Every structure is written in C-alpha cells, then in structure tokens.
Amino acid sequence: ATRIAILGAGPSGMAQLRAFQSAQEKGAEIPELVCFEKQADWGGQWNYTWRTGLDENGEPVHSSMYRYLWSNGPKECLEFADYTFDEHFGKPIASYPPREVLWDYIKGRVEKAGVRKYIRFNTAVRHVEFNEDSQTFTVTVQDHTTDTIYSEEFDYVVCCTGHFSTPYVPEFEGFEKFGGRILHAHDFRDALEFKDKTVLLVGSSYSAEDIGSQCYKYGAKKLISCYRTAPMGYKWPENWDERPNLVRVDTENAYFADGSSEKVDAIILCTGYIHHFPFLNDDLRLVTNNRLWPLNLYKGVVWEDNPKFFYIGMQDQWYSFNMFDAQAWYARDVIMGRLPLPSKEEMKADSMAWREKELTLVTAEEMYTYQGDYIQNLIDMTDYPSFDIPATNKTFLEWKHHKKENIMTFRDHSYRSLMTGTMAPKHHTPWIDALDDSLEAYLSD
Amino acid sequence: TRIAILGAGPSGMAQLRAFQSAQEKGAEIPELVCFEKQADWGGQWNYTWRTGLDENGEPVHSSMYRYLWSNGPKECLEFADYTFDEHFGKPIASYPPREVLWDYIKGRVEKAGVRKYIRFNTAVRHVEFNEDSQTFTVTVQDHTTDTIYSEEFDYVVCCTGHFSTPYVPEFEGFEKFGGRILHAHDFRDALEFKDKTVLLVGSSYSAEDIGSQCYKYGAKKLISCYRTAPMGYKWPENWDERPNLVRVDTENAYFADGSSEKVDAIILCTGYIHHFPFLNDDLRLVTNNRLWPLNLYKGVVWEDNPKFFYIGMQDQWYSFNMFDAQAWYARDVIMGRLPLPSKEEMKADSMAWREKELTLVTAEEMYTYQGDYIQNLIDMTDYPSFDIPATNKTFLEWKHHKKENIMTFRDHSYRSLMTGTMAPKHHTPWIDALDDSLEAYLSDK
Ligand SMILES: Cc1cc2nc3c(=O)[nH]c(=O)nc-3n(C[C@H](O)[C@H](O)[C@H](O)COP(=O)(O)OP(=O)(O)OC[C@H]3O[C@@H](n4cnc5c(N)ncnc54)[C@H](O)[C@@H]3O)c2cc1C
Ligand SMILES: Cc1cc2nc3c(=O)[nH]c(=O)nc-3n(C[C@H](O)[C@H](O)[C@H](O)COP(=O)(O)OP(=O)(O)OC[C@H]3O[C@@H](n4cnc5c(N)ncnc54)[C@H](O)[C@@H]3O)c2cc1C
Ligand SMILES: NC(=O)c1ccc[n+]([C@@H]2O[C@H](COP(=O)([O-])OP(=O)(O)OC[C@H]3O[C@@H](n4cnc5c(N)ncnc54)[C@H](OP(=O)(O)O)[C@@H]3O)[C@@H](O)[C@H]2O)c1
Ligand SMILES: NC(=O)c1ccc[n+]([C@@H]2O[C@H](COP(=O)([O-])OP(=O)(O)OC[C@H]3O[C@@H](n4cnc5c(N)ncnc54)[C@H](OP(=O)(O)O)[C@@H]3O)[C@@H](O)[C@H]2O)c1
C-alpha cells in the first residue's frame, strides 16, 4: 500500500535500504521500497570509474574519486554501528584504507541485508512532482538498459543523490588562451598524468590537500597551491608552496594576487561542488551552500515545505557513514509513523535554533563536535545502536593533530575502534611508498 | 499563440530568422521565446575552455576546439539570404577558422534583431504535452537567478543539436591506463599533446581533424584505429593506421593485428548520441546518426505529436542551408500556410524516404540524397532557392581534394553558388596557419 522511492544507491541510499531491512528483520511491516541508481553498481562516490564528464549513457559522471585515493579521516570515525570492520574483514586492518577497501566494506553490509533486489540500476532520475490531489509523488526516470522513460507513484521520496558531484568551476582571466589542461578536481583520475609536471592547484580544502599529495607522491616536478582567503596551513614538501589567489593566466604562465608569477603545465580547480538537483522544481529543491547546517531541513533531514520528502547526507561532512545511518534510521521512523512530526511552524524554529548555533563555530573541534551533537540527537530517537560519540570526537582530534605534525604521514597512524575497541595495526607500507592502491595489496603482507 | 524554441545554435537561429523574415514581409507572427543554457548564441560554434559540466553544472555543449577550421567548403554552407560577400564585404578563403564562421552566423541574426527573443543562461528541464489544454508546459531553469519556472506554449521547435552528448565505449584495461582518456567532445587544445603519442580511436571527421591538429601542433606520433574500414588517406610520416583497439594496459595499446605500442593519451573519436533528457517517450526522438531518422515528417515534424518539431537532427553534409530549409518549413506549418496530412500518410511518406536512404552506398549518393531532400523543403516555402546540383559538385571537388592530400585540402578554393564569386587563395598554407584568430585570418600576412 505504501511505496517509497529512494534516490541513489550511494552510502546514504544503502543506509536507507539498510534501515528498512533492519526494521523488517525485527518483525515490522515495512513499506514497498524502490531505489533508483544511474550507475551500474552501488557505492556512490566509492564506485570508481575511468570516465569523465558524461558516462556511457550521457548522464553526468557522478564519482569524483580518483586513483590512489585512501580514506581521509580515520576509518573508526565512519565505522557502521551495526556492521563492524571486525565482522567484515575478519581481522584488524590499518586506519586509512584505499577506496577499494572501503567500497568492499560498505557493499559488504548491504550484501548481507539482501537489499540489492530493491535497486533499479542504470536508471537516471528525471523528475519528481508532488500531486496535491492524491498527496503522492510522480517519479519519472530513464531506464538506460531498456532506453525507456517511465514514471511511478510514491508516497514518500528520499533523496540520497549526494552533493560532491556537480563541480563549482570558477573562471579566471586568460583561461581561453592557456595552453595546458584545465580540469576540475571532479575530473581528476590519475596522478601519473602529472608526473614531472608543474601543477597549479586552486583551493585550500581536502581536494587541494589530497590531490596535491597524490601528485607529489606520484612524482610531479613542482606544485603550487593558491588560496582564496586563507592557506591550508600545513608544512608542505620542498617543491610545494601556498600563495594568494590566481588573478590571471597567459598561454603558459599563471599570475597571482601577491604579484607572483609561475610557468604552469596544468591547472586543477579544487574549488568544491554545488547542490544541484535538476530533477526537482523549486517547491521541492534544496538550495544551499556547503555547510554543517543548511536550512529548511527539519532535524537535517525533513523537507520543511513538504515533510513527505526527505534528504540524506546533504550536510558538509566530518562524520560520514554513521551520520547517514542516523539520518536514514530517523527518516525510516518518520515514514513508518513511529516518530510524528511537529507543526510546520515548530519545525522551522528547531532549524533556526540549530542554525544560530552553527554560526558561533570557529575551530575544527567545535565543528565536528557540533555535528557529533546533531547525530547524538538523531540516534536517541531511534533503534540505531548508540555509539561512543564523545570518544569519536577525540579520535578526530588525534587526526587533526597528526595532520598538523606531518601532512604527508597522518595516514601512517592507527586508531582504536569505538565499536569494538579493536586497536588498528600499523600498515605494512608507509603511505608515501605504497604505490599499489588495490584491495588485494592492502590486505596482503 | 506562443512558440518555444529550444536552443540558440544555427538551427535555433535559423528558426528565429525564418519567423523574422515572414514578419518583415507583412505577416503577423506568433509570440516567440527561445531558451539557451549558454551565455551567448552560436551553439557548437561558441567556443569554451570548459569541459564536462559548465558553471551551472549543465553538461558542456560545444565539442569545438582551438585551431578548428571549417571542414567543408564555406560555399557549401552559405545562407541563401545573407551571403559572405554581404557580411564580410570582400572575398575570403574557403575554409574559415571557427571564429570567422561564428562571426558570419551572428551577423545574419544580429541584423535580423532576433536576440530580443532569447533567454540566455536558461536550461530546458522538461516539456510535457497536456491533452485537456492542447499546450506544452516547458519547465526551465534560469541560472542567472537560480529559479525554475514553467510557461505554456502552443508549438515547440527542438534545436538542441546531436553532436554534444558523447558516445564513449569502454575497452578492456581502460581502468589501469596511466595516460589521459577523453572523448573527442572534451578535446580542446592540441598543444597539450606536443611531444606525445596520441591514439585516435575512430574513423570519421573527428579522428581525421583532431589527428590533423595534433600533427600540426607537434605531436611526436599519431595512431588511428578503425572498427570496420580504414580512412584510406595518405597520412604523414609519424601517422599510423591500424585495425581496432582490443586492449590497453598501463602504458601500452594493443590492436587486433597483434600490434602493440606505447601511447601517452587516448582520444575516443567515436561519435555522439541523440539525447533529450528533457522529454518523455511521447516526444523523444530515438535514432542513430543518419540521413533519415524515422518519425520526422519531412525530416522535421514529430509524427506522434505534430505540434512538436525537430531541426537539424539528421546527419550532416549540408548544414546551415538545411537548417534554413527545415526552419522555413516548420514556420510555414506553424503559421498554417502548409496543411499536414494524416499520420498514416506522414508515416507512409517517411517510409519512402527511409527506403531510398538504405539504397545509398557512395558519398556522392548520400549528399545528393540530402541535396534532394533540401530541394523538397525549399519548394514549399518562400525561402530563396539555390544551386543544389552545383553545391553537390563542390562537395565532389572537396572529396577529391581530401583524397589527393588530406593535409592540404584546406588550401583549395571554390566558387560561391550564391554570388559566383571565386574565393581567393589564403595568405598562409593551413599547416603554417597556427594563429586561430578572425583578426589574423582577415588581415594579410
Ligand atoms: C573525492 C571524494 C573523496 C571522499 N573521501 C571520503 C573519505 O575518505 N571519507 C569519508 O568519510 N567521506 C569521503 N567523501 C565524502 C562522501 O560524500 C561520502 O563518503 C559519501 O560517499 C556520500 O554518500 P552519499 O550516498 O550521500 O552520496 P554519493 O556517494 O555521492 O552517492 C550518490 C548516489 O546517487 C546517485 N545519483 C545521483 N544522481 C542521480 C540520479 N539523477 N538518478 C539516479 N541516481 C543518481 C549517484 O550515482 C550515487 O550512486 C569523499 C567524497 C569525494 C567526492
Ligand atoms: C566539433 C564539430 C565541428 C563541426 N564543424 C562543422 C563545420 O566545419 N562545418 C559545418 O557545416 N558543420 C560543422 N559541424 C556540424 C554542426 O552540427 C553544425 O555546424 C551546427 O552547429 C548545428 O547547429 P544546431 O543548432 O542544430 O546544433 P548546435 O550547434 O549543437 O546547437 C544546439 C544549441 O542548443 C543548446 N541546448 C542544448 N540543450 C539545451 C537545453 N537543455 N536547454 C537550453 N539549451 C540547450 C546548446 O547550448 C546549443 O546552443 C561541426 C560539429 C562539431 C561537433
Ligand atoms: N578521501 C580523500 O583523499 C578526499 C579527496 C578529495 C575530496 N575529498 C572529500 O571531498 C569533500 C569536499 O572536498 P573539497 O575540498 O572538494 O570541497 P570543499 O571542502 O567545499 O572545498 C572548496 C574549496 O574551494 C575553494 N574555492 C572556492 N572558490 C574559489 C575561488 N574562486 N578561488 C580559489 N578557491 C576557491 C574554497 O576556498 P575557501 O575555503 O576560502 O572558501 C575551498 O578551499 C570533502 O568531504 C572531502 O573529504 C576527500
Ligand atoms: N570542423 C571540423 O574540423 C570537425 C572536427 C570534428 C568533428 N566535426 C563534425 O562533427 C560531426 C561528427 O563527426 P564525428 O567523426 O565526431 O562522428 P561520426 O561521424 O558519427 O563518426 C564516429 C566514428 O566513431 C567510430 N566508432 C563508433 N564506435 C566505435 C567503436 N566501438 N570502436 C572504434 N570506433 C568506433 C565510427 O566508426 P564506424 O565506421 O565503425 O561506424 C565512426 O567512424 C560531423 O558533422 C563532423 O563534420 C568537424
């Protein structure tokens, strides 16, 4: 009788299916589930592809992940509370696993849940309309396996389409004339492409940090990072420097705000992403910048203009997978009727409260502690196994510290699991010398 | 009555110009809105450094690159109603670079004053036909304001082109290759491939020219590979033609003849697909690239809904003249000047054209076919007639010049079939004509 459409089979869409399956396992009647995915497989960002721009169906390439990518936070900060690393890998592993390993892990859970059967792959979501007459959603999709466009009626929609895929790509003067590659971090795939090259990186967040680190590791001659407002702050290697922003570009040269000048071979724009939902009209569409707390989302999940429509993972992330889990579990309970929603007036007030609080945050520590607090709120309302949130916050602190000490070796460190207490062993190869990013290599000796 | 024109490239311009011409001659024309997602008109001919997704996250439309020149004789694409001699005021050479032909196209439409009809930076999201109102609801995203809105229209003309959404096949090992893999659509600047071995995958105009550009601008070596037939042209010393790619490894490309070689980058010159993410199956054209797509009465009228039209969806020998021929016809049908047959009669007519299409073997037969097709469209409207049989003759001359020497075909000259003016020789052999600019082309040096 009740039908839910879940948009995307990324970590969040997986979490949503996991949430319902978990309720069903406990004897509960769950609604009919349909999950639309445009890729051929699950994993979202984590499913790797050599492709760039548009995929073989003409849909924008989703994954922004690149070769040699490893986890950027401690894995212990993203461990599933109901599916441990210990359960999955059958043994202790190091704290910063390669993409393939974390992909194997998140798949591992949904494999055990039997939820693949709900996903229509190779299917891109085209449009979502709310019908006021029947109080249902018409979800229109393109099945690229059959080359068919069809639609179905749903009672609730859960958007898990992510927000690190549609690039924010600013222009700089001279770009039409520059003789080198100008790509966005989203199209970055292989560091080897930039070996012995001089690479300009425009940005001062994780993509700048890590893509630079990848180019360094795989042998770029020189790296130049430029910042908009403030530098990354770390002590970079001898051939890597940070400067004020790019101002213009020659056929061969880049010109910066400090009056500085350099000959660059390639420009990689690590300038972030936008919240882009081409399948939604303004009545349903979330419009926001990347932040810990976007507005119009009750408990960070419920669309305030239409509370039958939900968003997962739309916040900026310190916490990732177990946030999505907490979000999806909450969305489940609302959908199912276990948690009734307040007035539209009372929802907005709760959101503004969280917003006002977000505005006071200065330090990294305050910020992921704020997110930790948000998740604590969510899990308390739910079956989801409460886990050690304060102890996670101390793991993040140790990680921040490890980065400040040496940015090129923070991945060499190890952390205690906050689910099992399993002390993660030191990896068989220091990050810098571990050229192989395969799962097989990582789990071997 | 209101008409939605989707796209402001040559076809969208031709359609606006058609409506402007009838209005100049006394007739009352319908109200007109044209939607363009780019900031300026031109379609393919509007160059951009951007690739993949534009600043709004819309897929980058233009597949055009630095140093691109008309690939056929300009005389084969002259407007019947706005000659080169009118626009330029002096005789020029036969293969103008992009900027020069982009200037020409704008010239006609600036003069017509049809810019007032176009809403730029606006992406077409959806078009639905409503039975009860017999109108079209065009949903649209206005990126200047970040607003999604919808307007009702009586007729819709689709001019979104079909050489933008790449066909991108995968080959075994692509995931491991250390060099670049891009489709022709992403190719921007040949200088990126200076001192490099580039593999061009494919057999048509893209492989020919993208290859020619890399040769011109200093690639170490070039390798073409064909799926069914070699291009059969006499290539330079450092240019290799081989049967199809089978496999790739980290550094090396492998071919069906058992030949292997180290390649630095792979350019997939494998063509394009007809993609309309903004239409449902009731209006959506599905076809491979060819002279006679089915479902289009007179190659133009959508047969299941005759209030919807497609301009320029055919494969192209003729280009701009046909878009006029098609634009005039569609205008005359909208304005009621040309009555439509019953669907059965339309589909019988379309079947005839398809039957004849399948008999075509040689290049001559094919552009002569299109020639005949354009003649049929001209005859029904007030569009100035022109010397098709002689255009076909020029196409023939162009074919010989390519066959004789594929590297020098651009240095030949042809006679205007609109004015009789013989094009002069250009001041620089193509090979040495490194400067892109309109300025450099129109001056003497
Ligand atoms: C380069 C990169 C590295 C990262 N590294 C880390 C890390 O090390 N640690 C960490 O904790 N987090 C990392 N992240 C953060 C990341 O956002 C989360 O880990 C998580 O992957 C987000 O989950 P999601 O399911 O909400 O979105 P996504 O992972 O982006 O999944 C969204 C899914 O929806 C699908 N989709 C989108 N649109 C449509 C549509 N129209 N129709 C059908 N399907 C659609 C996509 O194909 C995709 O499968 C990284 C992100 C990026 C971009
Ligand atoms: C690389 C390349 C080189 C070429 N060289 C030549 C040549 O030398 N000589 C020749 O005669 N022909 C050439 N062509 C053929 C080309 O198809 C035509 O010259 C011409 O561009 C066709 O015009 P069009 O308006 O039909 O399509 P396009 O030029 O492709 O224009 C389509 C327009 O629609 C817009 N659009 C698409 N989708 C949307 C949407 N959803 N919302 C809003 N706007 C949208 C686009 O932004 C674009 O402006 C070339 C084509 C390519 C790809
Ligand atoms: N696992 C990994 O190794 C890894 C690798 C890549 C990405 N990621 C993930 O990807 C997500 C987002 O990372 P991100 O860095 O791409 O996004 P982001 O954190 O939002 O970073 C955006 C960056 O772009 C800069 N910027 C924006 N406009 C600019 C302009 N006009 N000129 C100069 N700089 C400009 C911003 O500078 P200001 O701050 O000054 O505004 C900021 O530094 C994170 O969750 C991260 O974990 C992880
Ligand atoms: N102005 C210029 O200098 C210029 C430059 C580039 C493009 N263009 C224009 O762009 C338009 C399209 O030209 P295009 O060449 O890009 O497209 P196209 O004419 O459709 O040709 C596509 C090519 O890709 C090949 N192909 C498809 N799948 C393949 C596979 N799996 N393996 C190997 N090859 C495969 C096809 O080979 P098969 O023979 O097997 O089918 C065909 O040769 C034309 O109008 C052209 O004029 C112009």
For the residues of A332-347, what is the DSSP string, one character each? HHHHHTSS----HHHH
CB A277 within 8 A of CB A299: no
DSSP result, A253-314: EEEETTS-EEE-SEEEE---EE---TTB-TTT-----SSS--SSEETTTEETT-TTEEE-S-
Residues in A closer than 8 angstroms to B49, CB to CB, are 175-176, 178, 182
- Token pair of A399 as six digits: 């990680």
At residue A89, the 3 state secondary structure works out as helix
**Pocket (CB within 6 angstroms of ligand 1):** A 7-13, 36-39, 44-46, 62, 64-65, 71-73, 78, 124-125, 160-162, 164-165, 279, 312-313, 317, 320
Contact B55 A171 (CB under 8 A): yes
- Token pair of A30 as six digits: 């769950």
Listed in sequence order, the residues at least 6 apart from B92 whose beta carbon sits closer than 8 Å to its beta carbon are: B74, B84, B100, B423, B424, B441, B442
The number of C-beta contacts closer than 8 angstroms across A and B is: 106
First to last CA, chain B: 52
CB B153 within 8 A of CB B239: no
- Token pair of A324 as six digits: 């999505």
Contact A58 B177 (CB under 8 A): no
Give the C-alpha separation, A253 to A262, whole Å: 5
Q: How far is CA A305 from CA A125, A142, A150, B352, in A?
A: 21, 27, 26, 54
Class of domain A1-170+271-445: alpha beta
Distance from CA of A432 to the nearest CA of B (A): 19
- Count Cβ atoms below 10 Å from residue A361 Cβ, excluding itself: 16
CB B411 within 8 A of CB B402: no
Q: Which of these, A71, A100, A102, A70, lies nearest to A85 by C-alpha position? A: A102
- Token pair of A106 as six digits: 């998140």
Starting from the CA of residue B59, give the closest ligand.
2
Rg, chain A, Cα only = 22
Architecture of domain B170-269: 3-Layer(bba) Sandwich (3.50)
One-letter-per-residue 3-state SS of chain B: CEEEEECCCHHHHHHHHHHHHHHHCCCCCCEEEEECCCCCCCHHHCCCCCCCECCCCCECCCCCCCCCECCCCHHHCCCCCCCHHHHHCCCCCCCCEHHHHHHHHHHHHHHHCCHHHEECCEEEEEEEEECCCCEEEEEEEECCCCEEEEEEECEEEECCCCCCCECCCCCECCCCCCCEEEEHHHCCCHHHHCCCEEEEECCCHHHHHHHHHHHHCCCCEEEEEECCCCCCCCCCCCEEEEECEEEECCCEEEECCCCEEECCEEEECCCECCCCCCECCCCCCCCCCCCCCCCEECCCEECCCCCEEECCCCCCCCCHHHHHHHHHHHHHHHCCCCCCCCHHHHHHHHHHHHHHHHCCCCHHHHHHHHHHHHHHHHCCCCCCCCCHHHHHHHHHHHHHHHHHCCCCHHHCCCECCCCCCECCCCCCCHHHCCCCCHHHHHCCC
- Which amino acid is present at B48? T
Strands B118-119 and B245-248, by their bridges, are: unpaired
CB A130 within 8 A of CB A137: yes
Strands B221-226 and B197-201, by their bridges, are: parallel
- Token pair of A437 as six digits: 């990013």
- Token pair of A439 as six digits: 């799962």
C-alpha torsion angle, residues A305, A307, A308, A310 (rounded to 10): 90
**In b/e form, how buried is each residue of A422-438, taking b as 16+ CB within 10 angstroms?**
bebeebeeebeebeebe
A171-270 homologous superfamily: FAD/NAD(P)-binding domain (3.50.50.60)
- Which amino acid is present at A407? I
Rg, chain B, Cα only = 22
- Which amino acid is present at A365? E
Distance B49 CA to ligand 2 centre (A): 16
CB B233 within 8 A of CB B166: no
- Token pair of B351 as six digits: 């079947």
Residue B59: closest C-alpha in chain A: A60
Strands lying side by side in the sheet with B252-255: B245-248, B252-255, B260-262
- Token pair of B130 as six digits: 């409503």
- Token pair of A336 as six digits: 């199912």
**Where along chain B do the CATH 3.50.50.60 domains lie?**
1-169+270-445, 170-269
**In b/e form, how buried is each residue of B54-93, taking b as 16+ CB within 10 angstroms?**
bbbbbbbbbbbbbbbbbebbbbbbbbbbbbbbebeeeebb
Q: Does CATH number 2.60.40.10 belong to domain B1-169+270-445?
A: no
Residues in B closer than 8 angstroms to A180, CB to CB, are 189, 191-192
Residue A186: closest C-alpha in chain B: B52
Environment class of B113 (CB within 10 Å of its CB; exposed 0-12, middle 13-18, buried 19+)? exposed
Phi/psi for B129 (5° steps) reads -95, 125
CB B164 within 8 A of CB B59: yes
B181 touching A (Cβ < 8 Å): yes
DSSP A432: G
Phi/psi for B361 (5° steps) reads -110, -60
A186 touching B (Cβ < 8 Å): yes
**Where along chain A do the CATH 3.50.50.60 domains lie?**
1-170+271-445, 171-270
At residue A158, the 3 state secondary structure works out as strand
| Helices A364-380/A321-336 angle, 10° precision | 30
DSSP result, A170-228: ---BTTTT--SEEEEGGG---GGGGTT-EEEEE-SSHHHHHHHHHHHHTT-SEEEEEES
User: Which single residue is written with the structure tokens 């950027």?
Assistant: A72
Q: Which of these, A393, A433, A436, A398, lies nearest to A414 by C-alpha position? A: A398
Reported structure resolution in angstroms:
2.5
Phi/psi for A245 (5° steps) reads -65, 155
Listed in sequence order, the residues at least 6 apart from B147 whose beta carbon sits closer than 8 Å to its beta carbon are: A282, B141
- Token pair of B197 as six digits: 């071995």
User: Which single residue is written with the structure tokens 């886990």?
Assistant: A387
Q: How far is CA A414 from CA A214, A399, A418, A427, A437, in A?
A: 21, 9, 13, 9, 18
CB B99 within 8 A of CB B437: yes
Give the C-alpha separation, A256 to A245, whole Å: 5
